[PDB]
Amino acid sequence: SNPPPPETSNPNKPKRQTNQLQYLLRVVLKTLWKHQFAWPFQQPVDAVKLNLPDYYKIIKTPMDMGTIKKRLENNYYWNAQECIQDFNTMFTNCYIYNKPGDDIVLMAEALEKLFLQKINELPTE
Ligand SMILES: CN1C[C@@H](Cn2c3c(c4ccccc42)C(=O)NCC3)CC1=O
Structure with a gap:
């Protein structure tokens, strides 16, 4: 009825961190x-x-x-x-489905503003 839960684990993918x-x-x-x-x-x-x-x-x-x-x-x-990209997809989905001015869009806009501010301070690759 709903789509399956998106994959959150990758078998055989090595554990690697990056600064970003x-x-x-x-x-x-x-x-x-x-x-x-x-x-x-x-x-x-x-x-x-x-x-x-x-x-x-x-x-x-x-x-x-x-x-x-x-x-x-x-x-x-x-x-x-x-x-x-996943963050951006999440926000885009909200903005293309919901009426502008609906509470959910105002909530998305506040979260995205904070997201983009933090992304301005992303460590360089
Ligand atoms: C991430 N979501 C949640 C979905 C349900 N939904 C909606 C509002 C809303 C407000 C608060 C919680 C859920 C809410 C809202 O303002 N107008 C209608 C849709 C729509 C969407 O894209």
């Missing part, structure tokens, strides 16, 4: 996760429960911070850009 991946987990994710607006974004959108039966028709690639958090904890990302 460390920053994305220990600074960026940590700051966004504790924000008062984080909660709609802490797990996949359950469009069946939330009565959004057109959501998956519009959103071909769902993404959320719970998935990102698990991916970072599991060292699923090969590089920081994959993780940054």
Whole structure:
């Protein structure tokens, strides 16, 4: 009914950290996760429960911070850009599905503002 949970662990992928991946987990994710607006974004959108039966028709690639958090904890990302893309996909999804001015879009905008500020201080590759 809902799409399967996105993959958060990669078998046979070696454990490798980078400065940027460390920053994305220990600074960026940590700051966004504790924000008062984080909660709609802490797990996949359950469009069946939330009565959004057109959501998956519009959103071909769902993404959320719970998935990102698990991916970072599991060292699923090969590089920081994959993780940054997941954050960007999450925000884009919100902006192309919901009416501007709806609470959820205002919440996404506040989280993205903080995200982009932290990304301005991303360590150089
Ligand atoms: C990440 N999500 C959550 C989904 C459910 N949803 C919506 C609002 C909303 C507000 C607070 C929690 C969930 C909310 C809102 O303002 N207008 C309608 C949609 C839509 C979406 O893209």
